[PDB]
Design a binder for these strands. Structure first.
Ligand SMILES: [Mg+2]
Lengths: 407, 469, 102
DNA sequence: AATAGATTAGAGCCGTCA
RNA sequence: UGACGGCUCUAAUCUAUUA
């Protein structure tokens, strides 16, 4: 006889029973409990009686408002009383009172006359009382060990949940850039274009640089805004292919490689802005960037409709991509933004509360797929006969470790 | 297709040489390293504040539960966990009359009233420390909500004292530095939250489901601030030193005059864990620039190397300077002009402003935590926030962001850098959490920097973290 | 020496005459509190410095140096650390006490 | 004094159940 | 200021070019 039998209510006293059973197993005792076993079933009955009758040395009972008048507990108490009579041991059953709502005058007749251990005001002194009682009654025990307790804990709540070797695929918010024009060209309108022309309003993306014009466009493009351009000798156009400056294998006193990359990024950003203007999508000037949204991608929240929105920035590191962000914006009637940034912050904080992974990714891919041009790509028009082609499916990543999502 | 890699959990250490991945589980199973005997507390506050603190102490002597025992381990009582006594009988009271508090919180000037209130409290604390017999391990400052509402720098009210920060907490902690008195600041609505309600009959802050989490946090902070060691790292290698750097702006002066503070961490060689601030604030006169002049860089690195040598007896075999910024060539040349010949100096940059988000294609649960994407031999992304299968939940609510780690200078192995950055997320003694989202070398250095930037009179400050956090 | 002495007085101590000098029944049996060698926080001071200072032949100078040496350590420990220490016991060699008179 | 890109810091509000 | 996380708003500085 080495076991110490703990009786309790299975779904109600689980916390205290687990705590006490693991503490006792750490101290070095041997414990039998129905929360210490997996793969149960026909085990109930025909095995509880055997362990109570032939293995148990002490019968700890957890006394609470739930264990009072419970059939299994009462039957186990009856068997324990018969066993106590069978042996010469009056201190075979030790009630433990924990429920402040169980008055000591409302105890079942089986244990009304027994001396219990109090746990209500604190559990540490109750544990000390149990330990002292066991030492005084010479209950069997081995050398104290708690590594054993940790190992056992693992066998149950760590196997049912750990990481698993499982191949999965993810979606990201990056869109790869597919096409680049062949040769960026600089048109020398040496003191031919007006000095304060504000070249940001032209028909194609342009960027002033020295007395030149940095653009992907064609020599006599944008003639409406610059009338005096037909008389222009085309041989004075300094032509540099895009691949060489992208790979970093170009540098000269006229322009460095980093500067070329920066101007290319500027051109890409302006082209994206102009195209989104072409797409006829609403704007939203954020603190430093601009967002876009549609007048499910639109829905309701009490008196305010929520609008999924995106913002896009183009980068050349790690690889040429167009990174996307996700936002929510709110309107009084689906057409006019509320002119209150604090209200927008509060609404966006309380609306993304219930949006999980799938919601975010599905809405993002729905919005991006809506901008697709024909079948699988989306082009940014850099000139009359120049385009930059961008993908409509985000980049995938692969991994070999995952979890089992055990509900 | 791009390939990801996984990094295993670092594990932490507890009493009896037992390792675990969680601090709550390992504290409930095994217990802390050292043996305290009991916490004797000094409580300065109003009468109702004293009653509130007493009631809270009477509340954490018993088990306290959360709503879910898997997502959040429960609290089995202070003495069950920490094997020491912290009870509401070893308390000394220093009354603060409410009339004074009302008097000083009206001057229509944030700086002046903040200075007056901090003076009010620290006067009593200092007098009690100097001229009395009772011994106090930690001082608990109970603060009404009206004081907390109007003392923020951007707080509206519906010269001599202007050389101080307009924040009560930082000024209070800085003006007590030259006395070295550990203290814990509590709001009145934090210990008795059920009583403070909004105009609907419900608590403003609802802790009903996370009471055990609050008990864990408060108990761990009180235990650590009284000289307790809750846990330590289990696989720190020998001869490696970790050095954090963070910049703050000394506002409220003619010169913004950026300042720099560092935090240090290495192995004791007694199998301990030396983790203390390394700070004498170093300055850069030029505005907007976050780089050290050669003199300051030489001084900082020399001091850190000398501290390591004195503790250990030899110079380090490797120094990792974690930072939130890049280094320039003057900075690193100054750094390299004092480092010993046979030492390796690596400068890492940890950045958070880099858009990238991975979405699982099927479920409503985010990416696994310890995943990483290696762009290049000198760069890689790292997910320190994400799903943790142990607790059947994630450390965030929306899709988490990764950290962009870059080996800016030196020559190292990026995989080992990621492995070391992930383990440093397991030392937030200022909280009781599963794991942090940022290395603690860059967080406690920031806390120190924001503490000793609210005053100008501080000289040779203390380095033990219990006087700042 | 301090650890030895603290361990000694945890048990009852008697005198030769129990009428003139009532016994000591042990520290905790009397004062109802715990004071053992588990709540100590040592601060080693190398004998090299102490020996070096106590040779200057000028009493005021060496007294100043010794006091500065000790109080710097005590104040640093008080201020820059999270440890709670109530009474700071100072164990001083005999030669320091002897040679610190006007 | 303007136009960019690219990098830094500071405040301040909201959610944590299910 | 018991934590942590995610957002939004507001400053700088550097680099190239133009005036
Ligand atoms: Mg704290």
């Amino acid at each position: 006889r080495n076991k110490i039998f703990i009786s309790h209510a299975t779904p109600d006293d689980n916390d205290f029973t687990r705590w006490l059973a693991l503490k006792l197993i750490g101290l070095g005792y041997e414990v039998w409990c129905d929360i210490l076993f997996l793969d149960k079933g026909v085990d109930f009955w025909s095995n509880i009686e055997k362990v109570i009758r032939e293995d148990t040395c002490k019968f700890l009972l957890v006394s609470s408002s739930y264990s009072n008048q419970r059939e299994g507990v009462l039957k186990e108490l009856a068997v324990a009383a018969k066993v106590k009579k069978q042996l010469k041991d009056d201190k075979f059953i030790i009630p433990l009172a924990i429920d402040e709502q169980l008055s000591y005058d409302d105890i079942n007749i089986d244990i009304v006359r027994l001396n219990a251990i109090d746990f209500k005001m604190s559990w540490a002194r109750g544990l000390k009382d149990i330990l002292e009682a066991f030492e005084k009654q010479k209950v069997p025990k081995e050398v104290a060990d708690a590594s054993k307790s940790n190992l056992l804990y693992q066998q149950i709540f760590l196997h049912d949940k750990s990481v698993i070797e499982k191949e999965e695929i993810y979606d990201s918010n990056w869109l790869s850039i597919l096409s680049f024009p062949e040769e960026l060209r600089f048109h020398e309108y040496n003191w031919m274009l007006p000095k304060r022309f504000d070249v940001r309003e032209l028909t194609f993306p342009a960027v002033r640089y020295k007395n030149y014009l940095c653009t992907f466009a064609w020599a006599y493009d944008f003639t409406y805004h610059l009338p005096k351009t037909e008389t222009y000798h085309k041989s004075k156009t300094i032509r540099i292919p895009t691949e060489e400056i992208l790979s970093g294998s170009y540098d000269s006193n006229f322009i460095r490689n980093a500067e070329c990359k920066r101007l290319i990024v500027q051109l890409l950003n302006k082209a994206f802005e102009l195209r989104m203007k072409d797409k006829e999508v609403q704007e939203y000037e954020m603190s430093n960037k601009t967002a876009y949204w549609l007048e499910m991608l639109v829905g309701k929240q009490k008196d305010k409709n929520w609008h999924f929105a995106i913002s896009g920035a183009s980068k050349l590191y790690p690889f040429p991509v167009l990174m996307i962000s996700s936002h929510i914006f709110f309107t009084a009637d689906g057409k006019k933004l509320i002119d209150s940034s604090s209200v927008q912050h509060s609404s966006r904080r309380r609306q993304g509360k219930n949006w999980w992974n799938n919601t975010w990714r599905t809405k993002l891919l729905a919005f991006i797929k809506y901008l697709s041009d024909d079948d699988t790509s989306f082009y940014l028009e850099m000139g009359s006969e120049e385009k930059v082609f961008v993908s409509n499916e985000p980049v995938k990543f692969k991994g070999n470790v995952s979890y089992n999502i055990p509900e | 297709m791009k390939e990801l890699i996984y990094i295993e959990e670092p594990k932490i250490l507890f009493a009896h040489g037992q390792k675990c991945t969680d601090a709550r589980d390992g504290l409930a199973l095994f217990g802390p390293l050292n043996n305290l005997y009991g916490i004797k507390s000094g409580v300065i506050g109003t009468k109702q504040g004293l009653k509130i603190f007493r009631d809270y102490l009477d509340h954490i002597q018993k088990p306290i539960y959360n709503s879910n025992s898997i997502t959040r381990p429960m609290f089995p009582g202070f003495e069950a966990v920490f094997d020491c006594k912290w009870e509401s009988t070893g308390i000394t009271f220093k009354e603060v009359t409410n009339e004074d508090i009302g008097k000083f919180l009206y001057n229509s000037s944030t700086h002046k009233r903040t200075y007056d209130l901090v003076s009010l409290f620290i006067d009593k604390i200092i007098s009690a420390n100097k001229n009395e017999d009772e011994n106090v391990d930690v001082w608990f400052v109970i603060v009404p909500d009206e004081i907390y509402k109007y003392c923020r720098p951007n707080s509206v009210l519906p010269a001599e004292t202007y050389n101080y920060d307009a924040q009560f907490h930082d000024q209070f902690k800085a003006r007590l530095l030259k006395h070295t008195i550990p203290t814990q600041i509590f709001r009145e609505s934090t210990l008795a939250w059920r009583d403070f309600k909004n105009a609907f009959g419900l608590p403003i802050r609802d802790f009903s489901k996370i009471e055990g989490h609050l008990a864990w946090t408060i108990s761990t902070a009180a235990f650590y601030k009284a000289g307790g060691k809750p846990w330590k790292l289990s696989d720190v290698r020998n001869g490696v030193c970790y050095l954090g750097l963070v910049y703050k702006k000394v506002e409220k002066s003619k010169n913004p005059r950026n300042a720099c503070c560092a935090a240090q961490m290495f192995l004791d060689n007694g199998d301990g864990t030396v983790f203390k601030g390394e700070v004498g604030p170093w300055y850069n006169p030029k505005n907007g620039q976050y780089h050290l002049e050669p003199k300051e860089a030489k001084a900082l690195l020399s001091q850190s190397l000398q501290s390591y040598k004195e503790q250990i007896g030899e110079y380090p075999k490797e120094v990792f300077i974690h930072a939130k910024t890049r280094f320039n060539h003057q900075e690193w040349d100054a750094f390299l002009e004092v480092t010993p010949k046979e030492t390796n100096l690596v400068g890492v940059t940890i950045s958070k402003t880099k858009p990238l988000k991975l979405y699982k294609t099927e479920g409503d649960y985010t990416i696994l935590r310890g995943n990483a994407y290696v762009v290049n031999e000198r760069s890689a992304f790292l997910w320190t926030v994400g799903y943790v299968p142990k607790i059947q939940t994630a450390l965030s609510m929306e899709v988490p962001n990764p950290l962009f780690i870059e080996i800016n200078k030196g020559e190292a192995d990026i995989k080992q850098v990621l492995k070391d950055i992930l383990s440093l997320t397991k030392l937030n003694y200022n909280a009781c959490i599963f794991a942090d989202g940022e290395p603690v070398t860059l967080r406690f250095a920031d806390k120190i920097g924001e503490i000793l930037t609210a005053s100008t009179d501080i000289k040779t400050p203390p380095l033990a973290f219990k006087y700042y956090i």
